[PDB]
């Protein structure tokens, strides 16, 4: 490590720690920028040489983290928790946690190489015919094909291509990750990830939330299963068993809005999926990002700066470069460069993803003048919820009319049921998946799920919570968890379950501050400068204050609460329950062993 980046001498008291924090800040912005820049160069141009440069940058960051981390522990480990400055407590507490920098050099190199190799496998995997990429090709098949055998070829091809080669690497990564965080005092990596929420009852609190939400999912599931039975027939759909995992609009069956046209309760009404109108009007990626920006500025939040428009990658490159297409938002930690990297497609659900990512950017812009260690959300679920909250307003039929995407307007009970069902496919179907992913990964980190049970335990949880089954036979050579982006790319997932509950708490609070008095699911906060100021206060805080206290200021309650989500969906919750009773459905999947047969002549077709 360059000596100019190493710590000097500081006194072992609060006066010394303030100077330590300022000196750390000056050098950390340099080390972080070089690491993010190297990752950007690789993720927008996957090559062996850019992987080498990114691993070199990662190794330098580990030397930096070790040097300042060991000094922080030597000087302040017994006293930082009693400092009077709460920002300083958070800075020192962060720096004393070394993570992968606890590993010796050879294991640091092995760790960084595994991250690079796992990333490459996921983002370059293809499905070749008798070759398709995940984005756009396989994504488009799962979203719009209604041929059972074509969907199966895409689902099986993807899970085999991405999952099978990842397994040996993921075993090695798990062991090294645990060895690293054990030296920071954590029993395993999952315990470190959960510690970010600073709640001793986290896992029990989540389980209680899911108990309140499960009946809504069970009723949506039975209603959609019935619609699938009418389309695909008794051979491929069991009305008392799990749904085949490739038939729900999405490679992971994680949200179902793309089969809305199969299940719409009142099909004679206006089409609430505005994708065809976007294409007819000639929308492109740039228009989608500018329309999202203008919602933020209508609230008197910040526009995107020039560096964002000059630096971002908003379409898949046409020179055939290999890129990581999975949409992501980037803070370069220099208070100037902020970017989105998205292989944008012109669809309604991509318009929502644009809002999701720009929500991350807006957070970065609002907290950029804090110390670098505090440039994060009050907790990770807060960061995920910002853009989704704006997207709840944008999706309303009234707002869509304002921006020219929905001509006919009506306010009757059937139109309300259509809208709420469409939103339930997006939000309620996701809840079991958002909950189960880190239940699986926490058990892997703890050793309760060893390599010999990776797929057995994944499919136990998928069936238990989502009520789906694999449409072809699987065994432990398959590694179907690895075919989901966040697993090989080592990004935690429980943030998304927290967000899908939290965003309805935020929506209720901002709608009240805006002076809106109608039904919650018809609120639009567009042009409410009062709502903007209440959101701005949260964003500018970073991680400087306990999230429970920030939440109480914002919504009046200091805990996650499912009641705003239930209140939003109340009308369709009742309607779905009545429909299923009238049709004599079984709620659940008591034939838990059932799997569908193979199509005739599969895969020749
Ligand atoms: C659409 O129409 C509803 C009312 O009609 C209901 O919803 C339709 C979609 C149909 O399903 C009807 O069969 C159904 O009865 C409008 O909602 C109503 O808005 C008014 C005005 O905001 C609400 O009155 C307010 O109530 C609060 C106290 O709760 C007072 O403080 C206010 O002063 C004001 O009186 C009313 O409660 C609300 N009704 C319901 C059932 O929530 C809705 O505004 C309308 N949508 C549009 C876009 O026009
Ligand atoms: C794990 O599965 C693969 C293939 O997947 C399926 O396995 C069975 C469930 C079968 O009913 C079919 O669904 C698939 O074959 C096995 O590897 C293949 O095995 C077949 C013979 O069954 C052989 O012809 C192929 O060459 C094998 N390789 C492939 C398809 O790539 C594998 O043996 C199973 N067991 C283990 C421990 O991996
Ligand atoms: C499409 C979205 N991509 C993630 C996200 O935006 O959260 C990407 C990749 C993982 C982290 N990330 C970032 O951009 C971070 N750098 C942001 C930050 O932490 O500051 C995604 O994965 N989503 C959206 C809802 C459901 C879930 C899914 O699709 O499974
Ligand atoms: C993608 O990354 C590669 C590096 O892996 C870039 O290729 C280098 O380009 C410079 C000048 O453009 C040459 O001097 C180097 O010799 C190249 N390296 C290799 C290994 O070929 C390439 O420019 C990048 N592409 C884009 C579009 O940014
Ligand atoms: Cl998280
Ligand atoms: Mg979708
Ligand atoms: Zn996100």
Swiss-Prot record:
Residues given in the record as Zn(2+) 1 binding sites: 356, 360, 384
Positions that bind chloride 1: 197, 495
Subcellular location(s) of the protein: Cell membrane; Cytoplasm
Boundaries of every Peptidase M2 domain copy: 11-590
Active-site residues, record numbering mapped to chain: 357, 486
Site positions per UniProt: Not glycosylated: 489
PTM text: Phosphorylated on tyrosine residues on its extracellular part, promoting cleavage by secretase enzymes and formation of the soluble form (Angiotensin-converting enzyme, soluble form).
Glycosites: 9, 25, 45, 82, 117, 284, 411, 475
Disulfide-bond pairs as recorded: 128-131, 325-343, 511-523
Tissue: Ubiquitously expressed, with highest levels in lung, kidney, heart, gastrointestinal system and prostate.
Superkingdom of the organism of origin: Eukaryota
Induction statement: Up-regulated in failing heart.
SUBUNIT field: Monomer and homodimer; homodimerizes following binding to an inhibitor. Interacts with calmodulin (CALM1, CALM2 or CALM3); interaction takes place in the cytoplasmic region and regulates phosphorylation and proteolytic cleavage.
Function recorded in the entry: Dipeptidyl carboxypeptidase that removes dipeptides from the C-terminus of a variety of circulating hormones, such as angiotensin I, bradykinin or enkephalins, thereby playing a key role in the regulation of blood pressure, electrolyte homeostasis or synaptic plasticity. Composed of two similar catalytic domains, each possessing a functional active site, with different selectivity for substrates.
Membership in a protein family: Belongs to the peptidase M2 family.
Disease annotated for this entry: Ischemic stroke: A stroke is an acute neurologic event leading to death of neural tissue of the brain and resulting in loss of motor, sensory and/or cognitive function. Ischemic strokes, resulting from vascular occlusion, is considered to be a highly complex disease consisting of a group of heterogeneous disorders with multiple genetic and environmental risk factors. Renal tubular dysgenesis: Autosomal recessive severe disorder of renal tubular development characterized by persistent fetal anuria and perinatal death, probably due to pulmonary hypoplasia from early-onset oligohydramnios (the Potter phenotype).
Further comment found in the protein's record: Inhibitors of ACE are commonly used to treat hypertension and some types of renal and cardiac dysfunction.
Protein name as it appears in the record: Angiotensin-converting enzyme
Source species taxonomy: Eukaryota, Metazoa, Chordata, Craniata, Vertebrata
